[PDB]
Amino acid sequence: GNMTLTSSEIQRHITEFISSWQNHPIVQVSADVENRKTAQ
Amino acid sequence: AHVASHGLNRKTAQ
Amino acid sequence: SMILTQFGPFIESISGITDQSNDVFENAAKAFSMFTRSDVYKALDEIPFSEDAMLPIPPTIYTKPSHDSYYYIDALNRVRRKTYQGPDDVYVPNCSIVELLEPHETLTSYGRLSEAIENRAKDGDSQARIATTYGRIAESQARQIKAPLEKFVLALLVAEAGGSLYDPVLQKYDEIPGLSHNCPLWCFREICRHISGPLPDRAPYLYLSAGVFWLMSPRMTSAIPPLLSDLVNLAILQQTAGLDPSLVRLGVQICLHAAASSSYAWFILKTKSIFPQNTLHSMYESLEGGYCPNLEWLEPRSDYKFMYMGAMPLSTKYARSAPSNDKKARELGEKYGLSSVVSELRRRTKTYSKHDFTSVRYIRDAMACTSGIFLVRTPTETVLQEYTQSPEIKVPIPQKDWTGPIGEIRILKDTTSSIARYLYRTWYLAAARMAAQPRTWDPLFQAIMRSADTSMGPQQQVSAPHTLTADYINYHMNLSTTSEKVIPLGVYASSPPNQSINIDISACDASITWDFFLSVIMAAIHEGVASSSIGKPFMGVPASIVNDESVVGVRAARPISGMQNMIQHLSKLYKRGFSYRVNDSFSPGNDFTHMTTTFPSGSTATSTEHTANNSTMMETFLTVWGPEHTDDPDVLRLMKSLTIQRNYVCQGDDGLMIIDGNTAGKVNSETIQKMLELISKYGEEFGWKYDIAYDGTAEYLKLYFIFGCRIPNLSRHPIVGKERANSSAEEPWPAILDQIMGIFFNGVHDGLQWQRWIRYSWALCCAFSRQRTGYLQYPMWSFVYWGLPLVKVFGSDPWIFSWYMPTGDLGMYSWISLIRPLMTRWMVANGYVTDKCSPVFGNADYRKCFNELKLYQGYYMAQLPRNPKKTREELAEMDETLMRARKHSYSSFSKLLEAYLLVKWRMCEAREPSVDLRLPLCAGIDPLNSDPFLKMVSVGPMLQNAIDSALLRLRTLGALAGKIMLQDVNTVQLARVVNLAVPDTWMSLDFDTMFKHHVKLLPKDGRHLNTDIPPRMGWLRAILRFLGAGMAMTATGVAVDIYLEDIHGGGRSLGQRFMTWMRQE
DSSP states (O other): OOOOOOHHHHHHHHHHHHHHHHTOHHHHHOOSSOOHHHHO | OHHHHHHOOHHHHO | OHHHHHSHHHHTTTTTSSOOOHHHHHHHHHHHHSOOHHHHHHHHTTSOOOTTSOOOOOGGGSOOOOGGGTEEEOTTSOEEEOOSSSTTOOSOBOOBOGGGEEEOSSOSSEEEEOHHHHHHHHHTOHHHHHHHHHHHHHHHHHTOBSSOHHHHHHHHHHHTTSOOOBOTTTOSBOOOOOGGGOHHHHHHHHHHHHHHTTSSSOOSEEEOSSOEEEEOSTTOBTTHHHHHHHHHHHHHHHHHSOOOHHHHHHHHHHHHHHHTSSBHHHHHHHTTTSHHHHTGGGOOSSOOEEEEEEEEEOSSTTSOOEEEEEEEEOOTTOSOOSOOOHHHHHHHHHHHTOHHHHHHHHHHHTTOOEESHHHHHHHHHHHTTSOOOOOOOOHHHHHHHHTTOOOOOSSOOOTTSOOOEETTEEOOOTTOSSTHHHHHHHHHHHHHHHHTOGGGSSHHHHHHHHOOOEEOOOGGGTOHHHHHHHHHIIIIIOOOBOOOOHHHHHHHHTSSSOEEEEEOEEOSTTTOOTTTHHHHHHHHHHHHSTTTOSSOOOSSOOOEEOOBOSSSSOOOOOEEOSSHHHHHHHHHHHHHOEEEEEEOTTSTTOEEEEEESOOOSSOSHHHHHHHHHHHHHHHHIIIIITGGGOOOHHHHHHHTTOOTTTSOEESSSOEEEEEOOBTTBSOOTTHHHHHHHHHHHHHHTTTOEEOOOOSSOEESSSOEESSSOOBOOGGGSOSSBOOOOSSOOOOOGGGHHHHHHHHHHHHHTTTOOHHHHHHHHHHHHHHTSEEOOOOEEOOTHHHHTTTOOOSOOSSOOSSOBOTTOOSSHHHHHHHHHHHHHHHHHHHHTTTOEEEEEETTTEEEOHHHHHHHTTHHHHHHHTTSOOSOOOOHHHHHHHHHHHHHHHHSOOOSOOHHHHHHTTEEEEEEEEOOOSSOSSSOOSSSOSTTSHHHHHHHHHHOOOOOOHHHHHHHHHHHSOOOTTTTTTOOOOHHHHGGGGTOOOOSGGGGSOHHHHHHTSEESSOTTSOOSSSOOOSSOTTHHHHHHHHHHHHHHHBSSSOEEEEEEEETTOHHHHHHHHHHHHHHO
16 A cells, blocks of 8 residues: 655665666667767 | 665374 | 764764654754854864865965055045055955954953044044944954854864765765865864964954954954855865865965955955866867757747757867967966966866766866855945946947937937947837837826935836836847746757857946937937827826927927927936935945936846847847958858847846857857957947857856856855845844755755755754743754755654755645654654544554654744844744744644645656756766756756735635636646745756646546545645645655555545635635
8 A cells, every 4th residue: 555765665766767768779879979980 | 674775283294 | 072972962863873853953952052162163173184184374364564554535535445456456455453452341352443443533533534444344344144153163063073974875875075184174273273372262253243353462354254254165065065175275275365465355356267267168178978968949039948859979079169268367377376276277177078977067166166255345435436437439429410409309310320320210119119009098007107316325207118118129129138948048058069159248337328328219219209199198297398409490399299208307317417325334424425327236127228228239230230340251141140039138238149050060160259359349339348258158147057057156155155235233033044044945956965965954953043032942843844854753764855845834744644654653662552543643642742742833833933023022022922832732733734644645656767867967966966866867857926816715715807717727826725836946847747747646546436536626636736746856766656546535525624724714
């Protein structure tokens, strides 16, 4: 039913948030600095 | 739970 | 260890170790009153300081020659000063003070201004008036603080004695260098000891309500009380912001040069632009990587409708293409002996080459080291520095391009050769289009708009149509003024492909006079109005007549309308100038009058017409003067592509012009400078001295952006600094807590180190709690009502709530509804059991538990008015009223909070993110600043009254005025009927999307049949949105999607309680 707040529940929310952000397709490919192939 | 939050006869026998 | 033996059980309560309690709070507040001023310095004597806090304090601070060669007496017998370096050297000098003192009784060491000198000054002595002038202005400079500094330093010593803290998000300790590595406190100890020396009691000045007292020694000068208030700010901000000490040492070194200077405030006035000039105006000489936002504003560009569309990485081509900085930034340091600071800043600035949180926090920590003090000078020199300047018209308009007078107005013939006809036609068209409106002619609107000299410690009846036609220019002709949406303007304008030009007008009040502006404007308004209004009178002025010599053929009578009759009576007021009158209490025998051409400082109608005059001259710049005065057709092509509706925003004197990116990348950054020279040349022809700036950043309404950055100015407001204009005493004691909460809520919007900031806010909060009158004392729950988050209570996890929690009953709902099954366990954990079960707390007597812990008394005691409303006996009345709330025992909370507490929610799953993690949105906040970094990504940043109360009070109860009965408004307006408002804290976030989508009023498994809102009384949804979005913001970490679970009494019987509160009012 109900639940209190716990650091366990905080980490449980944060890991789901970071996973749902990490599995975004633009995030999976894009990077900030081009490499020696892209610069060429 | 707080530490876990830091971390993450006879017949019957026979 | 003295502070440890004194304050053992309190520091563990506010560092996350032990649970917070009221008795430890009150036993600490008992001891906070019991401190001598020497005890703070005894506590400072014991801390071992490291080698990296030691720097050479100069000896020349203490020996300053006295004030006889600084002031003199002008003709008309008013006191002035003679300046030694520059004509703006009118501030307080630094000299020896002790020779003008006689000691107080009850203590020998401290003196005040002697009564014989003020007696002879009131009599009319020459030297005595100068001496009491210096004494009163030194008192007024020393007074500019909120509370005595020893209390702030003691709160620092209490709060930062708990060592490093622990993060429940990053699961690690923080690494912040302690008190041994804190240079402002080393200097604050050394100066205050070297003043006293062999003499004990070691406090260089004490602070009272009406006046100060000075330590009687030859070591005491006037520079010290601003210097100590300057050092305490850096000593706090080095702790609670995580500043780099290599910048804090420079910030202290500049202040030591300021105290060693001829004057302190004047040196800081001349050195207030070292940190942003070397750091912020010189960023990214070589850019290699980083993310930047991707905004655009929608195509009706006057609407200022913005849109966030992802974030793209930077490329090599978007470096700093703006011109250089070295030739003048090094010159500023070489003039004042700060080259060891300026070169130190430049060589450290040249090492950052990527755009992430690190280089952004570098800019924040560099801007923090400017000294935020309040400059103090007498009004008799404020006037005669500010109000004696005048505009210079290098190209005036000739006498051929006027006709004779129509009364007191000459008209401008349209065959003029000057630029003033473009100023003339905009005001003329504005008057001609406002006079034709039907609304300006019913008598009710004229009554609504109805509804000599001026001084300092009746123009608004006849100067109407100037303002009334200024509003038409600002809101209908050229919608360039944004008179909440200023943020996405600068985030677009600071992006990589576009640049921005920070145009500021210097001396906006001394700008416009009868010579160029007011004559043409009062000629245009006298002619645009007289077409539509012929004989029809205004509010109270009648029609009239006056002769003319418009055409040179004849003269005739030509009856005046009546609306232009005010133009006739008002241009004779503008033609001569204004009359001021002064009397400073800081120098007796100084009382005169003065004639200017400038305007008053802070009126309302003096802003709108200046904005209209800004936008009009910018439009005629970009249209006419531009192409007629330049070669280099890149500059011509650049000028012919932009107009002020598409890119120019102005709000006051300052403006912002945006030059967008083309297909080929960014605009060539040399033709922009060639246009800047033409702006500066254009201003000289009619008196404006622009303060144009081009570095790669955006400055508008004093907000600093770089690549869309949200850089807060920490030194915009200091902590221990308070403005005082007069010499009057301040308000009594129980109103200081509003400024202490102001310190906290101002620290919220700046991204401080949040565990350190809350922990220091507790130390101030417990220091300002007790006063002599049994003494008065606020319990610690009275401050929790005021929006102050907690650390660890009722046996919970440490550092568990956030300071994004609201204040009031909506704040009290949220943390109780989050902690409740633990609280009802902790009550039973020590003998608080009753037989019946409550629907909220169960079988535990919440009434006795809250009465003994004094939670009720804080809850009702915080709602008492802190204003001693209209004598010491009224203060005693307020004190007895405040003590009566503490002596009375209470039964329950208010009817609203009890009606709130029947609602139960649930935290199912976290929402998908709203913005990129690696994108630096806002300065200071980063993964090192964990909780705002989670909240701002999970929610998203904001990128897109009695009548309204009482009509909803009568509408929701059973009972435009024909429209309101059936329509609905949004949640933030419909839910103001129970006085719920979106708090000050949530203003820099996106509460709209969170209310509209991510607070569901329906459980995940369908419909529980208990949460059935009727079709009647559908206003309850707009309050349940707020009650849902409370706990989804108070809980630290990710803002979670929240679903409705239970209403205990039923949804129909829930709102009957709200209706009982509406009948009870």
